[PDB]
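Still learning folds. Look over my entry:

…
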Amino acid sequence: YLAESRKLAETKLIELIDSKISDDISIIDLAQFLEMMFASTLQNLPYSVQTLLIFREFDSLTRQFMGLLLHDTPSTITHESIMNFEVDVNYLESIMELKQCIELLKTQGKDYNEPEIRLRKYSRIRQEDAALLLSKIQHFVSSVEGANGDDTSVMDSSSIFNS
């Protein structure tokens, strides 16, 4: 029964601290929230299963930050904003498979191969991060400072190659 409470303990703390910090430098502050919660406090005990919660929570924060960058990206992508996603997701690649969401999207993705290679060549995350790279996020990266175009090479192959 104590094992059941330990499993449910790591479970409810996993979803708790997971969705707690679920809501650049703010993700680096979330990586500093990954410092204070995981890499300082939880690192003391778990060089184990926080190593599993490097997958079960933190690559589930690359799955969760994946789908956060893959739901529908309104205006958080540009030549600086998605370059700040390199300060978020390629900074999540600072440690070994989390180079996903800043790949093939960080440079104001609004091209045919930026959308279609945001689907087929922005991998290690889910492939919903093309419509949230060049369909919402190139009418929205085109709506962002450092615009690159609301193309149908962007929006059509981003809403088509992904979906």
Summary: Residues 2-20 form the longest helix (19 residues).
